Design a protein around this ligand. Structure first.
Ligand SMILES: Nc1ncnc2c1ncn2[C@@H]1O[C@H](COP(=O)(O)OP(=O)(O)OP(=O)(O)O)[C@@H](O)[C@H]1O
Ligand SMILES: Nc1ncnc2c1ncn2[C@@H]1O[C@H](COP(=O)(O)OP(=O)(O)OP(=O)(O)O)[C@@H](O)[C@H]1O
Ligand SMILES: Nc1ncnc2c1ncn2[C@@H]1O[C@H](COP(=O)(O)OP(=O)(O)OP(=O)(O)O)[C@@H](O)[C@H]1O
Ligand SMILES: Nc1ncnc2c1ncn2[C@@H]1O[C@H](COP(=O)(O)OP(=O)(O)O)[C@@H](O)[C@H]1O
Ligand SMILES: [Mg+2]
Ligand SMILES: [Mg+2]
Ligand SMILES: [Mg+2]
Lengths: 379, 379, 379, 379
DNA sequence: TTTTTT
């Protein structure tokens, strides 16, 4: 019958268009699933895939109204919804998905059955994903400077590696990590390194998600954690002064389930999938309002005890108590981190740690033996 | 006359399009009633049903403009409205509806008179609906290790079975159930098992539906309860501190009526049908602003008294009063629960329980003798 | 000359389309005046009336574009508006209009001169409108159980009958009736019986109209009171505690006028005709911010003093003060009420009460000898 | 084959239209990367570029329908997102981008590869960018008057020059500078000079961003800092009064990060780029809530020691202990400053200073030894 | 303030 109907049937046969649960129409272009709500991408996919059709059918696919007719025919054939993000050991990129169980990097048709929606936003460069490189040497030097691998800092180093590496798998975690340390110790440098490593799967929200009710009214901070694999809560304010609200234990206990409750502005969606590895950048000891067994089993803390300073404050840092080693500060480090110099090296280090630690199963274990408030309860 | 008008008349003769009370246009495709408020589905139904018409009539159902013309013709014939979800003991799936009185599964045109708008979303596979299976044995062991069938725990076990089986019927209930218990006991595991069992007929709202006014302004947390067969209000906070809002008895009174008043954003419809078995996952025993007879007969409480722990703190938990039986924590249990492995077995168990308990008639009976606050008013 | 203009003139000459003061376009199809905002029914009317036209004109009336053109022609002829709903003693049904002065039921064009906009939503069947029937006996027994016809309960019985029967007349009532009583007495049963009786002339709204202003912003809770003949506001909160807002006498005084000010979303029509009988289901004596004689002549109270109980707690209820009679609860009553078993019987009883009471003139009256707050001002 | 498709290809491959990460389209007309979300400038670009095509292609760019078709065809070719504002050493004007490495100024296609979004708002005129001019001499006299270049005031002079010159590059600053001085000293003079120099890349808001939280509710002051290169904080109230708000340290720590978290009204985007130099205009010694080493490395203070007054209080100014030199006040300065008589002269001075100081890298240093509150902790 | 708008 109609020629454009055959075009729609052929586009549907290759299985490039899917109907999601939320009602969006995800397409498959440039080896990455993409979607949008205000402007659907069906016509973009049609024009892109034009080339893979027979000769007499390609020339028919240039007039915009014919493309619109093909899209209208396509939209009348998608009746069944398909769920997304069911594989929790994959790291999708802009040109494929990097498998984590064995380090292979699929692309094209091979990297298609893993229906991943979110993506890092940048392509994968296999040349720089090699272990031996000067960038790897510099990165290893920096990592060892931040967390020295001595015997007194063994369990701390293992916890640091495990927590940092947990930011790759897209599963649900069950513990919160506190980056405790003094001033100018390396927390923000680690944050920026991780952000450059994973890219789009990393958001930074405010402290409001910890001490305020997250049910009444809109709360876009909760709504922006949808399908993210890492969330940072930086600069926790001190509580030694008055007027500062305590950390609600209910909020912590509500941030470790596969579905958190919260809605964005002007919308009615109230369910958010929770794949986030929540890390809190603090400067002082945290204080809570209620303490019980249900809270002490969901808290972990790693300590940074290496101070980077200038020659001016060398004697001040040497005689301090919160530091165990003093090192020379560097100026170009903060400069060339944003330029994505240690990106692929850190990615390789993270995947190596992931395959070393979480290969059978991924899980985080609380360490409540470090907080004095919980040390009192260790009765 | 116009051949398109004949097409519309033939489509209407098959009784596939219906005009519901709220003003939607439900269709009948893939053995399930579907509807969407944003985009109509009449064109999809026309395209899908083009096959059941003579050969000369099929060729006109290909051009989208003709399909829109037929949709416009159909929309000007539905004058009289009908109501949906009149039978409360039928479970609608994505490819049929399963009867609950005798376990018979209907499909096709036979499963059409029961106008069930809602659906679980996943198809029915009778090959996995049998009693003999290793999955059934594992699920039975898990259930018996969560709520043991000893003599001391007989009434609690039967109340647990009754409450869980009540999540299948499609009529109004009259009791709120609290899943009271200590930490690491088996509450969230039961919640996730039920979610895997009943699929999409299971929503999770915040605690604002309990300690806040649900009338003024928008409130999608109430508007999403429309025709839901189960509702969870998880993770209740403690009320022994300051500024802790008590549970308003007015909300509890309202949540047990056939109509719950509340509207979503950008809409005018304010009435919502209530089919939900409200279950609250709490950790401390609740306290209300006032206690009276009208609140005495609308609350039931079950107890979970089996702690799961790792060999680390085994003796620390064995020396506690809050537990009656200590077992070993299993890691992969949640991993294979999220994969929907114990879905159909638990569905079969739920059907068996419902047929054992509520087959003559369905009702829930309160247990007010569990709350010390309620105990004082009868002391 | 033109042809579609002749068809439009013929349609208008039959006097089937009218323009209201609010600016709507009411349509006379299937023996009922219908109207809707989202979907204009003029095309539906054209398609329905196609049958009573000359044959050479009927075939022209099948293309949707031609129907749209005829609708556009019709919309440009209605220059003068016509008032609606001026007869206050008519009950409009889905298949005609039932009189309330002599019990006769008109149909067809005879029941067209009464411009009735709203409708009950269900058809009228004279087969079940008889006096002798087992359902009538059951309903009479239930009514006598809820309100015994004793000498001490004589005035309350007649006030209850008058208040229930006042929900049929489409005029303005200047009194608010309170359903004051203790738990498990039968207020909800009466509400459900009334709802099954009248049908769509019954709206339930939240308590936000009694404790919050009804002017600021959109307020569909008040905007849905337009031409509704009954309004119920159950689950009245207690006020003995702190933080409970008292009932504003301003709202009560404003709700007793033939025009309440309130607007729905997406509209500018802020005038609402009040034909409702406001009834409140309460369990405590209501309180207000201030008490005055102007609030005295608008409030009436009936008392429910028949506790229904299961055999488990028969003795405890028998030893109570706030009850005068204890009976056995029936589980199937609420189940079979939802099936509209006692619909036409209660309709006939209400018609009989209306013919007995309000035939000369209809007016509600206050009983200020019930509320202790008002008894203070009578001291 | 097709003819408009080749036109769209020619428009695309010349790299004139680009897609941003937020979903908007930026075009290139009038030598500026302007964009509008409501008015698409694609048609304007097509009609402007029609001159650079063969004579047989121009005739098809006259019908508005054909230009709309070309726009629609172009919109279906932008698949990959492009990030903007990556070069931190380019100052964008309205008619081109001025480089800072060598002082050369580009325009047209040259100043196009640098995807600059924001702009100063005024055109660049090379004829007024000379080194010798009466405006240069008057401006140099003013600058030497406000900050005398004595050996007692050498470090302060160069620190002032560095802080002023830092307001050109688009990197991320890491220090806050206090323009602490007495009244009528010349702080507003420098503010107005800078505002005339850089124009649109300069905003001034209230002091609330220093004594308030930055997470609760909306914060339009944060959304105003997006891609701004200089922020001036004036009208700082005295703190030695009663109940005066204290400068919150947490705001200072959160205001020096590459991304500040905060959402504007009615919006959901919570991330913001921090390219702005923060200069605070106080009058007295600032007091904070808490002093710690984390606040020691984010504070810089310059001193103004030249008072201006009329001969009225000449002896009072000459005898005051807080000044170092007093001169005669001028009235026409604020007249010709608002007429931008010292616009390009100050710009050239700023460019010279930037080339002198921050040509290898950009970095601002703190100076903790200028406030006694910070001299207390020398122990 | 948001929602409502628009
Ligand atoms: N391995 C390293 N080698 C050289 N310099 C380093 C190294 N790690 C960090 N630095 C530098 O030392 C400083 C450490 O800053 P850091 O990231 O600890 O700050 P922060 O966590 O934001 O501080 P605070 O807790 O005071 O707010 C930075 O100037 C950084 O460039
Ligand atoms: N029968 C079983 N055998 C072994 N492990 C089990 C069994 N049932 C549950 N578990 C595991 O024991 C743990 C119990 O955790 P659960 O989700 O029940 O906690 P919870 O009731 O939500 O806790 P809290 O009150 O602290 O929030 C889970 O890891 C679950 O997988
Ligand atoms: N005549 C009757 N005989 C037997 N049972 C009856 C009779 N009338 C009502 N009932 C039953 O008694 C119960 C009355 O409960 P109902 O919901 O009417 O109480 P209520 O007064 O609204 O309660 P509350 O104010 O506490 O919410 C229902 O189960 C109803 O079916
Ligand atoms: N170098 C100068 N030469 C002439 N007049 C000056 C000079 N510096 C400041 N003034 C005059 O002093 C007046 C007030 O100075 P102002 O910039 O307001 O000081 P502050 O910023 O401390 O309030 C201005 O109107 C300006 O004309
Ligand atoms: Mg840092
Ligand atoms: Mg739990
Ligand atoms: Mg009630």
């Amino acid at each position: 019958g109609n020629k454009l109907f055959n075009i729609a049937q052929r586009i549907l046969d290759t299985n490039s268009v899917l109907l999601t649960e939320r009602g969006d129409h995800i397409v498959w272009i440039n080896n990455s699933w993409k979607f949008n709500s205000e402007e659907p991408l069906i016509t973009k996919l049609i024009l892109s895939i034009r080339h893979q059709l027979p000769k007499e059918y390609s020339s028919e696919l240039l007039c915009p109204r014919k493309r619109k007719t093909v899209e209208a025919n396509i939209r009348d054939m998608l009746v069944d919804s398909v769920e997304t993000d069911t594989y929790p050991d994959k790291l999708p990129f802009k040109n494929g998905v990097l498998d984590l169980v064995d380090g292979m990097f699929y692309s094209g048709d091979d990297a298609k059955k893993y229906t991943c929606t979110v993506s890092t936003g940048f392509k994968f460069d296999d040349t720089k994903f090699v272990e031996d490189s000067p960038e790897m040497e510099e990165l290893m030097n920096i990592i060892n400077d931040i967390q020295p691998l001595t015997d007194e800092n063994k369990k701390n180093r293992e916890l640091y590696e495990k927590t940092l590496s947990s930011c790759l798998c897209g599963a649900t975690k069950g513990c919160l990590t506190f980056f405790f340390g003094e001033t100018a110790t390396g927390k923000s440098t680690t944050k920026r390194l991780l952000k450059s490593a994973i890219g789009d799967l990393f958001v930074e929200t405010g402290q409001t998600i910890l001490t305020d009710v997250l049910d009444k009214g809109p709360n876009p901070f909760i709504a922006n954690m949808h399908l993210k694999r890492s969330v940072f809560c930086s600069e926790l304010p001190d509580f030694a002064c008055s007027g500062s609200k305590k950390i609600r234990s209910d909020n912590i206990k509500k941030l470790t389930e596969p579905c958190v409750i919260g809605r964005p502005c002007f919308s009615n969606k109230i369910n958010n999938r929770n794949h986030a590895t929540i890390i809190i950048d603090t400067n002082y000891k945290p204080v809570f309002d209620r303490i019980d067994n249900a809270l002490m089993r969901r808290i972990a803390v790693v300590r940074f005890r290496t101070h980077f300073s200038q020659p001016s404050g060398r004697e001040a840092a040497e005689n301090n108590d919160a530091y165990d080693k003093v090192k020379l500060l560097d100026e170009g480090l903060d400069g060339k981190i944003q330029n994505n110099r240690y990106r692929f090296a850190f990615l390789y280090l993270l995947v190596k740690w992931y395959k070393k630690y979480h290969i059978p199963i991924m899980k985080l274990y609380p360490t409540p033996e470090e907080i004095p408030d919980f040390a009192f309860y260790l009765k």
